[PDB]
Amino acid sequence: SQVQSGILPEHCRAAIWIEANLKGDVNALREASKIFVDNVATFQAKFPDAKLGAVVAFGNNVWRQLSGGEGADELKDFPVYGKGLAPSTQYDLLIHILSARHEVNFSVAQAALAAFGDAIDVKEEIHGFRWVEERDLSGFVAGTENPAGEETRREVAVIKDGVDAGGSYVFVQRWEHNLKQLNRMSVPDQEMMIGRTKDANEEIDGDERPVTSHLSRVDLKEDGKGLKIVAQSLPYGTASGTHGLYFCAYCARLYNIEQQLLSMFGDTDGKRDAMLRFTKPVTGGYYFAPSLERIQALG
Amino acid sequence: PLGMSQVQSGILPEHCRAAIWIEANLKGDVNALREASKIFVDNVATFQAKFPDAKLGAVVAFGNNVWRQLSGGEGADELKDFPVYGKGLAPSTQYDLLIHILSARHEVNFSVAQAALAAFGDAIDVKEEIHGFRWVEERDLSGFVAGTENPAGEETRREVAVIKDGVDAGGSYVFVQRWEHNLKQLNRMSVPDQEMMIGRTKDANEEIDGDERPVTSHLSRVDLKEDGKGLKIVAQSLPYGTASGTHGLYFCAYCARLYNIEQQLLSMFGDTDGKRDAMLRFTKPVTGGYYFAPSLERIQALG
Ligand code: HEM
Ligand code: HEM
Ligand SMILES: [Mg+2]
Ligand SMILES: [Mg+2]
């Protein structure tokens, strides 16, 4: 089973995420998905330098229909976390496009919209960009502990066997940063909020940083085994309007993502991520990304 | 370089892949713009030093009312608020301040835009912020190549865009106008009909002779000569928007005289000969403003 092309690429410069609801017959998604994955292959051949990839992924209700109820055992609608502190905006379809070249991504996004046509209702379209020094707009480097290299990224993100082999679970969550609130914090206070130093990007020892620090919330182990995810997140927005991080992660099980969210939003131990001092999530959804062979076998 | 006037760095660069434009109104006393503009151009120099490979430039430019105040009424003789053209076919949304940032790196442009906002602070009310991107093959989102006849090279671009002498030497006039394309409407037109609308062939970008295209074609509207002398402008326009939402062309041009821009607008919008640009069949302008970009030396004499 071959993995969709947008899960594994590293260090992308730009992305487009489109989140949409199904308005028409669920069966219209079958032909549209095949059209789109062929478009992606054609664009990769036309723009080899772009290192383009893309993913089509499906919400719980749609995917149960498309799959006949087989597999994707962990899939569910995204719930609130923290009783609502993390909101839920579960849609039916996610299209994630990434590459070195925003302009290529834009053409690919137009192709996705042509493939799905008026069967879908676009609810969100976000254009991500890698910022200076791969920093989040807060000024902290983002991506350091992300699984590195195809071998490890496959291990973390790609389902190994059975009916879902080559697929992955996806989580997307848009955050809105209040950089004015951030900038009122001293740099040492910001560093204790994240759990790494700001300029030099060195981890602060877990025994010496707050348990509410981001790293303490999300660097989770189960009897010594890390709960890893493959992030594809990027900055987005305008300088004068809304801006933040579009969080996007892939994992061979939803479990690892969910444990991190239960931790961040106070459900596990009553403590909340210190980043909520300056940024907040405003969307959230879970999706299942089938393998390419599974997509071809739809219609 | 005493006794000379240095152009702001964003007027002349060619083939930059990314831009940010910010348009804003002044909220309080115009004096706030003096120290903010000096800070901003200094920040630009710092970003150029930090990111030499970005090939970054930027411009700060001013609307008529605030430029008249800051200049004491000296110079900028052609400057005026952007008029409506075609009785409203081209709307007017004249603001007080234009920031234009362009480079080979969107991420550097973003940092520079943040610096501009920090410099001006609450003295301004941002009315729009547009992130331009060069599309594939330098095409407009309509699919036609954009930029072919734009003045080429530093020498010619300086001749067209940069005022040569007098108090305004090193300055330029700026026009910005955001267009919203209806690509569904465009795609209802056959490609031959689109070519007659533009005046060039779509795939190969060959000019269609003036006698073989309608007078409403875009090239017939805007390729204007006065007794054989072309009325040139230096465009810095780029595509913008989302695939599923608003998208189009953010039109931006610089010229040493506002006259050349105005003649093209009077032509496009029906004021000269009663005919209008065929591109209005699929796209429309929704903003419009004129600004004056002083020389970099003069931004330093503010205060
Ligand atoms: C505003 C939103 C977020 C910001 C700004 C942010 C920022 C960061 C930063 C600066 C780091 C440290 C550098 C690195 O290793 O990448 C980090 C690490 C990490 N983040 Fe986040 N993050 C956000 C949301 C999330 C969410 C929602 C999750 C999971 C559901 C998450 C999971 C992780 C993980 C697993 C790590 C690596 C921890 C480690 O093993 O050291 N992050 N994040
Ligand atoms: C929807 C907005 C616009 C679109 C899509 C558009 C597109 C084009 C295209 C495809 C060309 C031919 C290729 C080239 O030489 O660049 C062109 C040329 C040109 N455009 Fe536009 N344009 C727009 C607005 C404007 C405006 C508002 C003006 C002036 C006020 C203008 C002035 C020019 C000029 C002077 C030329 C060169 C003509 C020549 O000498 O051959 N354009 N434009
Ligand atoms: Mg660790
Ligand atoms: Mg000509």
Residue numbers in the entry:
A (entry chain A): 2 to 300
B (entry chain B): -2 to 300
Paper text:
The enzyme investigated in this work originates from the human pathogen Klebsiella pneumoniae and belongs to class B. All structures exhibit a dimeric ferredoxin-like fold typical for dye-decolorizing peroxidases, composed of antiparallel β-sheets with four β-strands connected by α-helices. The fully conserved distal aspartate is responsible for deprotonation of H2O2, whereas arginine 232 is important for maintaining the distal heme cavity architecture and might support heterolysis of the O–O bond by transiently and electrostatically interacting with the negatively charged distal oxygen atom.
Interestingly, the crystal structure of the variant D143A/R232A is similar to the WT structure. Simultaneous substitution of Asp-143 and Arg-232 by alanine leads to increased accessibility of the active site through the distal access channel. It is noteworthy that crystals could only be obtained with the addition of 5% glycerol.
